[PDB]
């Protein structure tokens, strides 16, 4: 199969990139690779027609949220590549996310989010390099009013990286990413 | 209960911050969080008045040694925050520390400390991003002369971050932090 | 725990139009209006976060065209203590619409006399929001109150300080049920 | 005839701080407060000519740090006709947090952010007229301090904040004549 | 143990006014006062961290109006060794009129003018050290308010007046911990 990868210094920009890829065409999100220092990589698999059309729509939507690093599509990876590297071929409710380069700024953001609307804080993701991401789930208008109220309280504490809301995250996103809706 | 957090890019600045908090007011150090890249966060809990009086007292002492990132107090955290985040509420010998952004500079620092006086190298703490901290224990006279001799021998090798000595660490510090004196 | 939506207007006319645009935008219930004096009035609607937030945006956009808007805010999940001590409707307990507001009782009487003489409208009474602000309310046909308010405004401008003039062709059922507009069951 | 002391403040918060400083300076009885509308409120105390004179001065200096002081006067021996026709009283603890906003919407957001920030109880609201509304919360001195500070900030982005003050230990005579949620009875 | 609150003023009048404003502002206990000589005195209150810090901010603004404040500090949790070795209280109403003068002659003339003005009682005088003395009188609010105004005007023509203040109704905790002639 073909290979598509998107790397973002920010867990929020990678989830938005992974969400836009599975919605653009019929591709499978095999998971995400964490290389430390706040860097994460979304990996999708499929045929050349879908993975190349999904990669364009994924990068186009990730540039508006996070810090895009690299974007590339491999039409036919060599058999040795899949054998030694984890690319997934080796032998729901709304989504609200806030990423802060600082654990203190992320806790204050999560505290103001659950106080604003009736949303559920499923946990937090640590991508290394001081980057932490708070993840909440709920209705579409609940998480929108929660992230905007949480970002406002966290800007006075730490360095806010990215804030995004996905109204209808694809089922492929909730399965491969730890977003509280895993099977 | 209230919530108090102090984030420092440096393991030495966090220990001095945690030591100054439990000594100033009546709060409990529930532990510490390592977000990677050298970032660490001391988390204390108590009443609204004691946490505020201790958080600034620990911030004023932490600015003398390390780079303080964020300092914040949450009076009444929501019950959903404590359920999904490691904030403690989920359903004596002297201390000598030397932090170096380099493993080579830390080993020479630890080697010069145990040779200057009679101290015990209980181990080393890896906070990420190349930051490592050598921890020695003993009486006040030894760790005072050990760190001073270890600091002079470490500057000629690597990038020294912080050097500090706590004569009598509070009993709450040795319980929640890996400093070789855990009951 | 329902949602909360509020729109405060220093004018009874702008508040009624704001309350009419909210119940028409989405599925929200107008629990009533709060009079704080000095002409300040606050329309309060409740429901879920999706309908309340979408109604206040449509209410503010239609209220800025007729009156002076003070503040517009939405609380998605109010605390239980807020609903227990303040009247937000959650507690332990179609004729056309023509309105003219004047800071002065004399200017309102002249406006009311010019409206009933211009077309076939019924002066149901007047509303006092305090601070010298009064509002005349007439009901009738959509074109009757339309030609009456434009004639009542033109005659009141020569007497007192005219604040706002607006016409609602078909007010929502929730509007007449919670507001004293002469068509309350 | 007992003496008469009055302090008028265009703001409910400044009048409460004035009343708290008067009963703590000398021994005077807080008979109540007179609401003349438009945000103007007048605290009335009575006692000896010297006790009222000293409390009148101490209350004014403390009330200037929060609200707008309108008039401050002391009558040594009021006429019998004055007490008969005017409600002047002789007609024959828990911490306190207060936020006053010219706007009902700004006061609701201030109260909603206070009960969520710390362990405080919203006892209700006070309407002084002219669009002035005051949110009153009670609780611990550490709680109401962290609550009013978080409530004042969250309300400045909504409405026009008038005054914000915190009384750690209000006098027993204040909670008896003023509606602060701690009236014994 | 409990929290600690201290206000130091170079003047016995500024300290009593500070101590009176603290016990009225929050729930704190005035354990007494400390005299370090040279006109320096320190009022010591104790309670919880929130009340002591809230009472200390009110005692400072009231003391700056009268006396020359020197130090204002609060200790949240004092060590056990501190309470055992230092006199900090944890070792296991009529009107008030005061006139302070850096001179014994000016204090006697002020005390003579106070008792001659109205019906007040001269309970005695407090020697702060370094030439500082304070005359204390009690009585009703009408007499004490007029006695100090007549005493200050007669004391400025004699010596160096430091501070003059009147407390209409001093707190019960003040008369119990300070020698103000009304201690039971």
Curated annotation (Swiss-Prot), chain E:
Artificial BMCs can be made in E.coli by expressing (Hoch_5815, Hoch_5812, Hoch_3341, Hoch_5816, Hoch_4425, Hoch_4426, Hoch_5814) or (BMC-H (Hoch_5815), BMC-P (Hoch_5814), and 3 BMC-T (Hoch_5812, Hoch_5816, Hoch_3341)). Cargo proteins can be targeted to this BMC. Artificial BMCs can be made by duplicating this gene with a 16 residue linker between the copies (making an artificial BMC-T). The shell assembles into balls with holes where the pentameric subunit would be, and can be used as a model to study assembly and permeability. Pfam families: BMC. It is found in: Bacterial microcompartment. PANTHER family: BACTERIAL MICROCOMPARTMENT SHELL PROTEIN PDUJ, PROPANEDIOL UTILIZATION PROTEIN PDUA. The lineage of its organism: Bacteria, Pseudomonadati, Myxococcota, Polyangia, Haliangiales. InterPro entries: Bact_microcomp_CS, BMC_dom, BMC_shell, CcmK-like_sf, CcmK/CsoS1_BMC. Homohexamer with a small central pore. When purified protein is examined by atomic force microscopy it dynamically makes uniform patches about 35 Angstroms thick with hexamers in the same orientation. In the BMC the concave side faces outward, with the N- and C-terminii exposed to the cytoplasm. CDD domains: BMC_CcmK_like. Belongs to the bacterial microcompartments protein family. This is Bacterial microcompartment protein homohexamer. The keyword rRNA-binding does not apply.
């Amino acid at each position: 199969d073909a290979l598509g990868m998107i790397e973002v210094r920010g867990f929020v920009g990678m989830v938005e990139a992974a969400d836009a890829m599975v919605k653009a065409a019929k591709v499978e999100l095999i998971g995400y690779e964490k290389t430390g220092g706040g860097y994460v990589t979304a990996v999708v698999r499929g045929d050349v027609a879908a993975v190349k059309a999904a990669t364009e729509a994924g990068q186009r939507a990730a540039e508006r949220v996070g810090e895009v690093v690299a974007v590339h599509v491999i039409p036919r990876p060599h058999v040795n590549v899949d054998a030694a590297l984890p690319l997934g071929r080796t032998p729901a409710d709304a989504l609200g996310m806030i990423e802060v380069r600082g654990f203190v700024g992320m806790v204050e953001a999560a505290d103001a989010m659950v106080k604003a609307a009736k949303v559920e804080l499923i946990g937090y993701e640590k991508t290394g390099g001081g980057y932490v991401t708070a993840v909440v789930r709920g209705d579409v208008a609940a998480v929108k009013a929660a992230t905007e109220a949480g970002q406002r309280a966290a800007e006075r504490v730490g360095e806010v990286v990215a804030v995004h809301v996905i109204p209808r995250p694809h089922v492929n996103v909730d399965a491969a990413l730890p977003l509280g809706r895993t099977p």
